[PDB]
Design a protein around this ligand. Structure first.
Ligand SMILES: C#CC(O)(C#C)C1CCN(CC2=C(C(=O)OC)[C@H](c3ccc(F)cc3Cl)N=C(c3ccccn3)N2)CC1
Ligand SMILES: C#CC(O)(C#C)C1CCN(CC2=C(C(=O)OC)[C@H](c3ccc(F)cc3Cl)N=C(c3ccccn3)N2)CC1
Ligand SMILES: C#CC(O)(C#C)C1CCN(CC2=C(C(=O)OC)[C@H](c3ccc(F)cc3Cl)N=C(c3ccccn3)N2)CC1
Lengths: 142, 143, 143, 142, 143, 142
């Protein structure tokens, strides 16, 4: 079966390819902003929203990957094939957990309809020719 | 943060830990079951429940992990080291995903309440020493 | 003064002496169960029941015994001369705690009367010669 | 599993520590108190209150500590011992079982509220410069 | 600007100055008292009063000062000079904080009115020469 | 006890770590802007708000620190350990009294809800990757 992480939220993996893969801030910055003012709500015993739910399942699925990145560093004796794994997890796999972490946190902050309009408005700027492309990128705010 | 992926659904991971590793069925059976009787809803653009939502995020997160073991096979060289990683994903985290994949799917066909009532009732079964322990474990009916 | 901790709950110590001392699960399994099902109620500012109160004062009694049971190692220079310290109280005395932790937890999950009828029922089961009756045993559950 | 045995009784462990440790009477005193005014009430088969319940469990928990302080001593002879053993029991948790055995015994004979009103009413009286305070202590009435 | 931290609460610092230095109890007792019977409200996200708000800003500002005397101990070298700073914080500003810490805490357990009525009534006591002065100072009751 | 200066105002010390420590204008600029159009209200005999109250207690607690910075300069004979103190007070301790002074004055100027939204909107810009990070930072205004 072909599940899309963003389908139920009115988005799609298509629409998020609009954003360049070198947008989405670091996983550090994301998780930090999560525990900023959602720390309480995330540890709450009640699913505040479908957004909150996915954010929890994403944060933990990432946590499983940091437990993997540690066990690999302390059980793989060959450091040529040990640092080939601890790189892929913190780089390539981290990208999917950056899009997901951005999307859900941005929604809890600004609103899912505001986010979906941002994804579209960005796809006008990013696809606007460099000559007329305005100096400032569109940024989510209030 | 300290996030229990079961706190939402009236459960805890401590309650889910009592289950022995030989309890949950294979990840292949866990995904064959999911697609067999929830696919239409899982691929749907409707947040059918908090249960469904978390199931998707789990099925996907695991699909991420099988992309890792596919990459490790054809990018990691040392055959004794690439089968140390491939055996960790396939086993140690696999149980964590078998615990979660089972839970959300179970509560979909029996309800969160009937499931939690089981976990408790099973908890007191396995906690009973084998001598006084009833011959067969309690089994989950729709009741 | 002879205070029976089970008296106010419709039972006696003479009764829980019936379930053969190796029937009650391990203290950790007990405590985990208390965390899994009653943690929130145990940290509440409301005396949820006479059961909750006694169990709070019991987990903390053993919380005064871990700490003291289970003690000597960070303060006793002498590692040995404890053949039946040791332990021992964690065997011939730290069994009272397992009885209480079971009784109160079981009653909070199944009901005071349900447990008092199970105390009796299972009591007559094990008291049979290991003979004809039966294969299965009485067990607290949700049938 | 952070359990405060005073929380259900509208108090905290911090508030009991607010009183000086030379305040709560000896355990031999406290145990003689219950058997004096409540012996019938405690050996009673109905939980007269949450206090009666907690106090019964406390007296037995202490009885298990004078059973341990006796069995450490009744094969040994190396130091005392009764050295770093039957002193610690009768020093550190001894204070705790003086604090607890008092609190509950008091509320039965005074009133849950009057007890808490007093714990504060004392506690700070002793924390008051002598030149400007009542001659002797403030003392529980009702 | 000229801000009197007492002008808000119907008082003045001149009225608060009449109190001799031996009057307010120690800063350690002033913080032990605060946490003993206001902590739940002090840590609360509710501006319980203007009194509470100012108390927090004072308890914190003092916690800042004990971070200064902790830093001065292990960063200032000259032992005769680092004990000149440590003695200033612990004494001269400490009295200012004992004046303020006492005031807001006092008005919390007796009301702003009963407190201000005292400060006046005490003001006329201490202002009386010892010969004609009543033997014991007036003491603050809940009245 | 663990008091948070910002908890009651709907904020938290977490949320203010969003802002880089080299934001918050000088203490001079802060106190000057305070006496600009709040001079009257701050010296008023009535607590205009909980914000006004904390601002008063913060300005004075700072004033105590400038009395300390002076007494140190004229009673510490050793100028190696005298200028080690008058630096820490005007630098490290001054930072906490800059966040506090900014936060409360900004609220009295723009509104506590507007400020809390600024702290969030800033935490999007500051955490937005330098490549797409728009030339102008979000600034509080009207
Ligand atoms: C009447 C009757 C039966 O007794 C029969 C036959 C019932 C027993 C429960 N069964 C279903 C079941 C699970 C589930 O929901 O299935 C969709 C789930 C499950 C969930 C997902 C999977 F992939 C596989 C399973 Cl195994 N779990 C369990 C389970 C696990 C351990 C012990 C007993 N039952 N079973 C079938 C009906
Ligand atoms: C719930 C229920 C029930 O009460 C119901 C319905 C069951 C409960 C368990 N019972 C076992 C049983 C006896 C008894 O309920 O002992 C507690 C009694 C018994 C009675 C007195 C004793 F001292 C010991 C026993 Cl062993 N007798 C036997 C027995 C007789 C013949 C062969 C083997 N076992 N078994 C059967 C009934
Ligand atoms: C009846 C009667 C009593 O007379 C008795 C006993 C009352 C006298 C006031 N007492 C309390 C008190 C202060 C306060 O509010 O306590 C929380 C406050 C106080 C406030 C904060 C502290 F940390 C310590 C104190 Cl000390 N101040 C004072 C104080 C200061 C000087 C002279 C007399 N009383 N006392 C107790 C009741």
């Amino acid at each position: 079966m072909d599940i899309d992480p963003y389908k139920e939220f009115g988005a799609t993996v298509e629409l998020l390819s609009f954003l360049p893969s070198d947008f989405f801030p670091s996983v550090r910055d994301l998780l930090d902003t999560a525990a900023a003012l959602y720390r309480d709500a995330l540890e709450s015993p009640e699913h505040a929203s479908p957004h909150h739910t996915a954010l929890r399942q994403a944060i933990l699925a990432w946590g499983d990957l940091m437990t993997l990145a540690t066990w690999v560093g302390t059980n793989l004796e060959d450091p040529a094939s040990r640092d080939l794994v601890v790189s892929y997890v913190n780089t390539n796999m981290g990208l999917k957990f950056r899009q997901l972490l951005w999307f859900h946190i941005s929604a809890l902050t600004f609103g899912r309809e505001t986010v979906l309009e941002y994804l579209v408005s960005f796809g006008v700027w990013i696809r606007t020719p460099p000559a007329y492309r305005p100096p400032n990128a569109p940024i989510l705010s209030t």
